[PDB]
Design a protein around this nucleic acid. Structure first.
Ligand SMILES: [Mg+2]
Ligand SMILES: [Mg+2]
Ligand SMILES: [Mg+2]
Ligand SMILES: [Mg+2]
Ligand SMILES: [Mg+2]
Ligand SMILES: [Mg+2]
Ligand SMILES: [Mg+2]
Ligand SMILES: [Mg+2]
Ligand SMILES: [Mg+2]
Ligand SMILES: [Mg+2]
Ligand SMILES: [Mg+2]
Ligand SMILES: [Mg+2]
Ligand SMILES: [Mg+2]
Ligand SMILES: [Mg+2]
Ligand SMILES: [Mg+2]
Ligand SMILES: [Mg+2]
Ligand SMILES: [Mg+2]
Ligand SMILES: [Mg+2]
Ligand SMILES: [Mg+2]
Ligand SMILES: [Mg+2]
Ligand SMILES: [Mg+2]
Ligand SMILES: [Mg+2]
Ligand SMILES: [Mg+2]
Ligand SMILES: [Mg+2]
Ligand SMILES: [Mg+2]
Ligand SMILES: [Mg+2]
Ligand SMILES: [Mg+2]
Ligand SMILES: [Mg+2]
Ligand SMILES: [Mg+2]
Ligand SMILES: [Mg+2]
Ligand SMILES: [Mg+2]
Ligand SMILES: [Mg+2]
Ligand SMILES: [Mg+2]
Ligand SMILES: [Zn+2]
Lengths: 36, 172, 206, 58, 143
RNA sequence: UGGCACCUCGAUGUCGGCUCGUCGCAUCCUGGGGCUGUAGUCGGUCCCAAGGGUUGGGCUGUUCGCCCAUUAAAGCGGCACGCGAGCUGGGUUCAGAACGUCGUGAGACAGUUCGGUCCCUAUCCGUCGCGGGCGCAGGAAAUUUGAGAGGAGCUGUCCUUAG
RNA sequence: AUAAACGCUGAAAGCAUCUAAGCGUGAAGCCCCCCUCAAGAUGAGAUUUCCCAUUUCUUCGGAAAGUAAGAUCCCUGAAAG
């Protein structure tokens, strides 16, 4: 998990969602997990 | 787009009481509540639902109501099951009547008891199945069984479903 | 759960069958009777009331004499209550014997400590002295009372005062030997209080 | 006086604001002291004045 | 000159029972505080007590809009260093509804000896049963 | 480290150590997790977490720093650089004397060196203990519920599971 | 009961998705459990037992003046100070 103020997609299969009112991306590559 | 046209196959007893609901089939009894703000329709063999408000806070509820009515109808008719297989040396499974045992490389056996409405049967020491008539309980019990020893990417040893692409590495 | 009341007789040692030598404290528990029974329909909680020693009718007064006469006995000197106990036993006026315990049970001891008078902060709270040479003029004093900013001194600033005499319970404390005929109870270790104190013995909570 | 008049006029289904507006609009020029006196110990006359104020508003 | 000032015991003080099912906490407390103060009578004298007695039932169903049931905190300090304690509003509604209502109403009364006398006229029950049937209270409807 | 010169020159005592602590979290240890260029043992990085814990000496007045031997660890900061009507007085910062240097000189030097008076019976609040009075709609003797508050809260090594 | 986190079912957005309605796990931390104080908690609580309804005056309100249960003055002391 990467905790950044600058969450954004990192490849062509990343996906951006919202959980409990905060932006995060999820990918099948675990290196791409991000959350604000 | 499209979230309508529920069809009752056969032998399914569905009734509506206030904001509640009640479904009976050949398997078991399922009862649960719904918000009054949604609209439910009943006749001999078809179910329909409509959203009067038609906004964000109501379309999702319309969809989920349709989905879980479909789930309750199909569960008592056809049933639900999940597939778990154990990979690696020394991983077995035995059934002590209505009780499940697992040897997953720990210094103490781990015990699982199937709650009401679900049945755990073990065809072979290296493969198990869970049965039931609602998706939620069966899925959650299978998830709890797998969570004891989830798969690991280096060799693949662990408990896993039959249809996931677990990632693999080298680890020289 | 069981319980009796007794007096601290003394302090001694015995040899076990294994061979080792252990210290024990002797407790005499004669003449204690069940006085009153408290119920949840009448009081809000369940308890038993026990009285320990007979005392002369010269020393007792009419209220307590009627209270003890309600259970057909003579006035008692110590009266206490036990909770977490089963009310099915303990008929009113029945006596409690030391044989309610057996060799090997784990108990709790409750009593009032020995009294130390107005004691300083080094005996009372275990502080540290200041240097006693190298020109120092600070030996057995409390310390700094705090910073400057609050314009005051906080609470729990430990200071001299009356030291001992509080209720103390020490727990998980094994029993060694029971003598029914002499009404004594040999229990391994220390218990709070001076000699002739009241000791309240009861089954370990944990 | 204002608090007392407000309390007495809320029992006629009227605020202090509406009652004062109606009294000004009807032409009555009684100060708050006399109105508070009437509210305390001549409640019938106070109700009469409140009725007149209601008439003026509509 | 001539302005009416009430005297102790000169004004009748009645009893009311108020059902608190579904009403917001502050919106109920404001009305109750006005009733206790005595501001609904044309006999209102600021320096004495002319208000009524209030009984509140069903305090366990009081309403809390928004996320107040979890995000509103009640703080205490024991005046010992580091002795601050917290408690959320939903927990108190579940466990001590009476104390929740009492804190809410007490914050809205004057902060003097008369306010301390007025606070003693409020009885709050978490259920629907009260023990003051001897006073023959009436039903009060909000607004 | 500075800038300003707003309170204090009819006096707001200064560095280090001792006694006594309390608070913040930007967490040193212990607890729970995500990613790994994570085979295991050991690590790196980030996330939640302030409950407890966080060593004894050699040199220097020293803070700091280096070193010795340990430890699960030897956290960073605030409180008048916390704490002198609680202590010390080694340093700085009084009168004596000497060195190097500057000055014609009397003398001077964030250069050095040896020696150099640390006053006070606690009124009010505050803190720690202990009593008298009245109240609690009659006067007494015991046994108690518990709103509320304080305390405690740490952690190693060995054996087995198992080479 | 939760924090970070991991999930089940599930639409908005025919798919996907731990969240939007609804469920389950989850920390030396929070609230309990453990030890002590605690009804001046003026919101002054509860139980068991004991004494009883005297005499003078009062404009009622009320006052004094001998007592009951009980306690103390005074005296011998320590396990307390
Ligand atoms: Mg970037
Ligand atoms: Mg020392
Ligand atoms: Mg000395
Ligand atoms: Mg202050
Ligand atoms: Mg500065
Ligand atoms: Mg200027
Ligand atoms: Mg100055
Ligand atoms: Mg001055
Ligand atoms: Mg943090
Ligand atoms: Mg950690
Ligand atoms: Mg860790
Ligand atoms: Mg700490
Ligand atoms: Mg040496
Ligand atoms: Mg510090
Ligand atoms: Mg100072
Ligand atoms: Mg300082
Ligand atoms: Mg100093
Ligand atoms: Mg000082
Ligand atoms: Mg010196
Ligand atoms: Mg000189
Ligand atoms: Mg020269
Ligand atoms: Mg000398
Ligand atoms: Mg010297
Ligand atoms: Mg010197
Ligand atoms: Mg002094
Ligand atoms: Mg007292
Ligand atoms: Mg409590
Ligand atoms: Mg208090
Ligand atoms: Mg502590
Ligand atoms: Mg749980
Ligand atoms: Mg725990
Ligand atoms: Mg009482
Ligand atoms: Mg003797
Ligand atoms: Zn990606």
């Amino acid at each position: 998990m990467k905790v950044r103020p600058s969450v954004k997609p990192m490849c062509e299969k990343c996906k951006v969602i919202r959980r409990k009112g905060k932006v995060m991306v999820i990918c099948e590559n675990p290196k791409h997990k991000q959350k604000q | 787009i499209g979230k309508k046209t529920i069809v009752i196959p056969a032998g399914v007893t569905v009734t509506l009481n206030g904001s509640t609901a009640t479904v009976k089939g050949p398997k078991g009894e399922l009862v649960k509540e719904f918000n009054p703000e949604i609209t439910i329709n009943i006749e001999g063999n078809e179910i329909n639902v409509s959203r009067p408000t038609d906004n964000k806070n109501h379309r999702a509820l319309h969809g989920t109501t349709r989905a879980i009515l479909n789930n309750m109808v199909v569960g008592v008719s056809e049933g639900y099951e999940k597939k778990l297989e154990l990979i690696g040396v020394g991983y077995r499974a035995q059934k002590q009547g209505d009780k499940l045992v697992l040897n997953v490389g720990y210094s103490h056996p781990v015990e699982f008891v199937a709650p009401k409405g679900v049945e755990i049967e073990v065809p072979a020491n290296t493969q198990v199945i869970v049965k039931g008539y609602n998706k939620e309980h069966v899925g959650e019990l299978a998830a709890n069984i797998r969570a004891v020893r989830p798969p690991e990417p280096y060799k693949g040893k662990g408990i896993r479903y039959e249809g996931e692409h677990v990632r693999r590495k080298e680890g020289k | 759960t069981k319980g009796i009341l007794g007096r601290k007789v003394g302090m001694t040692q015995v040899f076990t069958e294994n061979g080792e030598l252990i210290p024990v404290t002797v407790i005499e528990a004669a003449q204690n009777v069940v006085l009153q029974k408290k119920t949840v329909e009448t009081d809000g909680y369940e308890a038993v009331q026990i009285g320990f020693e007979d005392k002369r009718a010269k020393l007792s007064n009419k209220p307590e004499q009627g209270h003890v006469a309600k259970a057909d006995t003579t006035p008692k000197r110590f009266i206490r209550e036990f909770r977490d106990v089963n009310l099915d036993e303990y008929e009113i006026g029945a006596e409690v014997k030391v044989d309610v315990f057996a060799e090997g049970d784990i108990i709790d001891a409750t009593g009032v400590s020995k009294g130390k008078g107005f004691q300083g902060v080094i005996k009372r709270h275990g502080q540290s002295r200041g240097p006693m040479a190298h020109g120092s003029r600070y030996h057995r004093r409390p310390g700094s009372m705090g910073p400057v900013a609050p314009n005051r001194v906080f609470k729990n600033k430990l200071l001299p005062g009356r030291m001992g005499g509080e209720q103390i319970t020490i727990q998980n404390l094994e029993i060694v030997k029971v003598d029914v005929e002499k009404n004594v109870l040999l229990v391994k270790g220390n218990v709070p209080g001076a000699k002739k104190a009241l000791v309240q013995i009861k089954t370990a909570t944990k | 006086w204002i608090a007392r008049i407000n309390a007495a006029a809320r029992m006629q289904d009227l605020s202090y604001s509406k009652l004062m507006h109606g009294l000004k609009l009807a032409g009555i020029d009684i100060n708050r002291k006399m109105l508070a006196d009437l509210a305390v110990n001549d409640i019938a006359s106070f109700n009469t004045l409140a009725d007149s104020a209601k008439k003026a508003l509509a | 000159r001539t302005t009416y000032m009430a005297k102790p015991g000169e004004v009748e003080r009645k009893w009311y029972v108020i059902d608190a099912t579904g009403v917001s906490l502050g919106r109920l407390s404001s009305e109750v505080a006005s009733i206790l103060r005595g501001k609904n009578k044309p006999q209102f004298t600021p320096h004495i007590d002319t208000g009524d007695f209030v009984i509140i039932i069903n305090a366990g169903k009081i309403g809390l809009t928004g996320k107040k049931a979890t995000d509103k905190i009640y703080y205490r300090h024991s005046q010992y260093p580091g002795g601050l304690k917290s408690r959320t509003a939903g927990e108190m509604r579940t466990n001590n509804p009476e104390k929740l209502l009492e804190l809410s109403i007490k914050g809205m009364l004057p902060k003097n000896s008369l306010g301390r006398q007025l606070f003693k006229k409020l009885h709050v029950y978490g259920g629907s049963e009260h023990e003051h049937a001897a006073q023959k209270p009436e039903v009060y409807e909000l607004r």
